[PDB]
Amino acid sequence: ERMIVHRCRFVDFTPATITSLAFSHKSNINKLTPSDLRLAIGRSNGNIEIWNPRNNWFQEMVIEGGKDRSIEGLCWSNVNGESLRLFSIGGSTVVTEWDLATGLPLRNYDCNSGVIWSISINDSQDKLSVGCDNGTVVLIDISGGPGVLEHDTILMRQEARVLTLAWKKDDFVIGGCSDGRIRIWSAQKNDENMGRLLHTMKVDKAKKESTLVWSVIYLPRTDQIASGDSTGSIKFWDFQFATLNQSFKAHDADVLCLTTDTDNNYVFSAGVDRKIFQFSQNTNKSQKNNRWVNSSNRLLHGNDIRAICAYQSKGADFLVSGGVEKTLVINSLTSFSNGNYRKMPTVEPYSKNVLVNKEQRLVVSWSESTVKIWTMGNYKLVCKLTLKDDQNISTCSLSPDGQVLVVGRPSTTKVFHLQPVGNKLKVTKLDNDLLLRTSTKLVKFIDNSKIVICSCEDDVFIVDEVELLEVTSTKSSIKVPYINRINHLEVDQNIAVISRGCGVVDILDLKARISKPLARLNNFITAVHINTSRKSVVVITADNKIYEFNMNVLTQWSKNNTDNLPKEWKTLKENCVGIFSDIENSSRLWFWGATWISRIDFDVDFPTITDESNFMNDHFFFTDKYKPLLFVDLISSNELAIIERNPKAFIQPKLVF
Amino acid sequence: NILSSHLEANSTEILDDLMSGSWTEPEIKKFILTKINTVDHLSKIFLTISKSITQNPWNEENLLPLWLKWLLTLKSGELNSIKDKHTKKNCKHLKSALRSSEEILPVLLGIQGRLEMLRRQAKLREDL
Amino acid sequence: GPLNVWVKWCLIIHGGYLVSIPNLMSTLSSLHSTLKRRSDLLPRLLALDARLDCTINKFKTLNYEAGDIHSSEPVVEEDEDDVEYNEELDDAGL
């Protein structure tokens, strides 16, 4: 019998709606693109993830906060020469300054006033504006590297829930507020009006509904401010003389965000009826008049937009948007009417969320602070555990037996053992206190009783001790400090393999626990897997170049077939995520990305996105018909399990003909 | 039985009128259900029944056009554009053979009304 | 019907008198107009019956073919399997 497949659509797992995003760097159209470009997504269950837009958008680092915490605003700080830092908000009154080392909030400044609604970093990144809910706008000074946050001043109070902020320079903070009005506070050193506002420009209201401006940004070339509000009225105000240059009732419902580019020929607005459209000032007579046209329109989405961003370079220029349907849509920026857009898949699970095991033919599926275990045969949804001390979930791996389950959380991680009494399980917690007090990123089950643990402090231990070799600090790793941080490790019978996001992959002994690195990689190491047959570990980077290595370094299969790879492997968009080997030939290996599956041999040889700059330093089988793909593996010998995904809005009606 | 022999004759040769005779010997809507449960390329029995219906539309035997209308209302999907050599003129003069019924139905009900009228009025003319 | 019997039995019992009445359709012009209004729409309601019978008979035979889960189904979703395992720390504390 051929490979019998499970189309399995059990697990109701979905990321929550994305609410905010922000690029790291600044645009600088006529500059070669920096190697440290990052893009931070913040959803509505507090799981701030990051992405790197080069090499077709590989997600690397997830910083997840658990039950009942959100993020409705975040921003980057990159002063010239120091660590890139994220300042995000929660639902309540704290600017949380995250680390970019190991996913921990290194500072949580409770801001003195109100409930925070929006952040805006200042230019030259020394000051920061938050907008509270009592009416205040608070300035926070951030200087002295990481960890430091001091309140500087609050500006002049008022009686409107301050909704959005944006700086002009180091001087003027523009804030749109929930009465309708957008106000312009000044906050500049050595000048007699500090903390005072200057003007309260007033957007046009409506009688049946409280109109409230949802966003406002500054436009530096034509010295304007663009405002978007809750009647769709995108209004372009003049900055000095403080009044309305022109107006548009373009949109049809609440405009929620907008952006521009580095020299302000374009303003891209996007609202709640998902119609993202682009106002232009491209022609020379239109910039002589400095007047904006309602140039192009585009519908792209299913339900909403709740955030947008833009980026430019001399090798990359694109816009990234997202809404209450959970995806991420990318358009070419300077060719918005011309450009070939791209939809991202809703899950590219480069930190996986569902595991299987071949004893009892069972599948474990861990949602947020909740695990669910079932098994095969039809099937039976056996058991469901919820944990209340565990809040933000992580990797949750099962033994090579139906006994020991380790559930990870970077604060407190636990172990149970499992008594199968038939149609239900019995779960018995066992106290492992060294485990409960350490911090875990990867738990991988060397033997059936003892496990290995990675650390949040770049150590490696054994539960039921291990050393590693150091790694040099490149200036990009100074500029973003999780490049030099171990991201993957695989074990099977006293041999381990680790791999950072730097491009270095080490072996690891267990009978002697010495490193022996074997670096061999330029760009980001996506997926690794040891192979007992031929003593060969397989890596695959984000470039979809597959490699295998030998310990005590190369096979000519890895020398030839990598650069003579198959054609789908050449033109592949979505990156690989998971690797595993076959049941019957231990050197035929069946691995997978989130939109495809490739089963490869080992000897059968054969005869937009950012691309300008260098790396992050300074028989064949291919199928596609399981595209909303969560997790594929092997239940048992002849069978192969897909784990798939399956399911108001604005009424933008399709014309019937 | 009769349906099995009819299916064997239909998959064998051009004995479709004998297959209609075998389904007549079975004489069952269940037998019609059995033959439409039988799976093959079931063409050209429509051609036989088109010639038979166009040469005798006023035949008292309900069972052969009931069998083929049950075939039409059950396999009405998988036959539409699959044949277009002779089937357009075939179904066209079949429809021309079948317009006569719906143009004579009101006058037939009129004669039925006259006959019911005359029958029960002569029954009322009873002479004590 | 329950007075269509009435409007026919007057014709059946008395026909010859109103036949010999020299102006039939002039003073009976309302009733046969009503009846031709009632009876001139036969062919498309036959079409209604044809297409409705076709669709509901096709659905009926397909449901009779594929209605093989009419005793006990919809398993592998249990509140008792969830019972206190969905707590899993209330039982750990208490």
């Binding site: 189309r7 | 009931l66 019924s101 139905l105 | 036959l46």
Partner: peptide, 28 residues
């Protein structure tokens, strides 16, 4: 019998989802 065949051949004239778990197979 005439009105029976008449109505029967006017009848002739006017006669003129995702399940949660499945099991499939692939190739080699």
């Amino acid at each position: 019998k005439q009105v029976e065949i008449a109505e029967r051949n006017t009848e002739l004239w006017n006669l003129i989802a995702l399940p949660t778990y499945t099991m499939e197979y692939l190739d080699i």
